[PDB]
Design a protein around this nucleic acid. Structure first.
Lengths: 52, 85
DNA sequence: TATAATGGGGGATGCA
């Protein structure tokens, strides 16, 4: 995970950080023999795109 | 010995090849719709270009005689289609 | 037309 924009607010002896974070959550799919993978390696997909 | 050279298909490879065949059939079925020609002729030209130049003959059932000239004309008419066609 | 089946059963002489 990386932090895009990092804001902050000075309060008393502490700081409140407003972070804009970005990352990737892996999800494992199991493929069956009768199925066919129709998406290449490292392909940028969106919501609804058919993978298999 | 000539038969023991081609490996035995795995289930996955089997389904793969079969699927590709069926998809090819449908693809030609729509290509004929696009070009407004003949399915048998088209699939025969595809067969021709696939197998190479070793096999070229007039197929009993097809109206046009399949000589390299004609298959060149048809293949050039196949290259004259939009990316989605 | 659709369980799955995938590799068989002598005898001598001329010529390359």
């Amino acid at each position: 995970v990386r932090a895009a924009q990092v804001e902050a607010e000075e309060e008393g002896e502490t700081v409140y950080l407003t972070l804009f974070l970005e990352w990737t959550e892996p999800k494992d799919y199991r493929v069956q023999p009768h199925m066919n993978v129709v998406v290449p390696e490292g392909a940028r997909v969106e919501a609804g795109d058919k993978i298999v | 010995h000539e038969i023991g050279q081609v490996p035995l298909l795995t289930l996955e490879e089997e389904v793969e090849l079969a699927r590709k065949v069926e998809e090819g059939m449908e693809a030609i079925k729509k290509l004929s719709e696009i070009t407004g020609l003949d399915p048998d002729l088209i699939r025969e030209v595809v067969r021709a270009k696939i197998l190479g130049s070793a096999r070229v003959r007039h197929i009993p059932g097809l109206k046009e005689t399949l000589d390299p000239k004609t298959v060149e004309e048809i293949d050039q008419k196949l290259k004259s289609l939009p990316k989605e066609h």
